[PDB]
Design an enzyme around this catalytic site. Structure first.
Site: not given
Ligand SMILES: COc1cc(-c2ccc3c(-c4nc5ccccc5[nH]4)n[nH]c3c2)ccc1O
Length: 262
Positions: A16, A122
């Site tokens: 999003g 990450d």
């Protein structure tokens, strides 16, 4: 004091968008990540779960969440400093004392995560944020996961992350330890801050620049811009054997890590 205005987009990712939200009465600024479960109800619940555990000055704060049907709202600390990505000047990097301070705060945040039994998966400059006082905070736990529980470590088997940041075991092995992968990624982030470029596309033996590094050809780009002290640490982080690779308690003992600069 609980009604907000979506002022501007901040990061339009896959799940999003992060939006800036200013409260109408207090003027309080928060970052809200907007995730639509219709346009994943699994990896979104884990992000919320992990966030609720986290409390640390080098981790972006989690305030709460509203459900509003399928629009999930993640109320998170806002960092007006932006991404560390934008403080890296391409091909040059940044002043070495700045790099050391951001690397200290990154270590602190990561020791904490490894302490609570969680791994980010990450770590990269786009996931590292500066606040108003220029302090670094770790953001985006959408790939994060538990690797120790009840004092029992579990090995990972899911491949995830970003290729130029990923450790070589993650490509080679069927199963691997979580922490060394995190450590490896921090060492890539350091190369980035000090040279202003990534060393390779991936750490696979079918990648020339990676083969050149194992062959100790530190006379080439990336490494010739670095400087012998921080380079000596990079030699201990970017080791192909996850077991031989330096750990964090030992990064805290390193010569460049304890050198006064800033
Ligand atoms: C700590 O957990 C999360 C944080 C975030 C997150 C992502 C971005 C931001 C930002 C932010 N500040 C910016 C300033 C300039 C440009 C982009 C920015 N994103 N502030 N706070 C955040 C928090 C997203 C997902 C998470 O699971």
């Amino acid at each position: 004091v609980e009604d907000w205005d979506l002022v501007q987009t901040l990061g339009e990712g896959a799940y999003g968008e992060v939006q800036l939200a200013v409260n109408r009465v207090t003027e309080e600024a928060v970052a809200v990540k907007i995730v639509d479960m219709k346009r994943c109800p699994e990896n979104i619940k884990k992000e919320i779960c992990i966030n609720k555990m986290l409390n640390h000055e080098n981790v972006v704060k989690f305030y709460g969440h509203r459900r509003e049907g399928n629009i999930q709202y993640l109320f998170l600390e806002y960092c007006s400093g932006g991404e560390l990505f934008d403080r890296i000047e391409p091909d040059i990097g940044m002043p070495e004392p700045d790099a050391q301070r951001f690397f200290h705060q990154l270590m602190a945040g990561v020791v904490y995560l490894h302490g609570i039994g969680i791994t980010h998966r990450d770590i990269k400059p786009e996931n590292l944020l500066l606040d108003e006082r220029d302090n670094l905070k770790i953001s985006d736990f959408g790939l994060a996961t538990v690797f120790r529980y009840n004092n029992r470590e579990r090995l990972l088997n899911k491949m995830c992350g970003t290729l130029p940041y990923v450790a070589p075991e993650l490509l080679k092995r069927r199963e691997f330890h979580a922490e060394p992968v995190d450590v490896w990624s921090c060492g890539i982030v350091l190369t980035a801050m000090l040279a202003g470029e990534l060393p390779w596309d991936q750490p696979s033996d079918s990648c020339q620049e990676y083969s050149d590094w194992k062959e100790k050809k530190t006379y080439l780009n990336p490494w010739k811009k670095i400087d012998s002290a921080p380079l000596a640490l990079l030699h201990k982080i970017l080791v192909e054997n996850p077991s031989a690779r330096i750990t964090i308690p030992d990064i805290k003992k390193d010569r460049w890590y304890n050198k006064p600069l800033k």
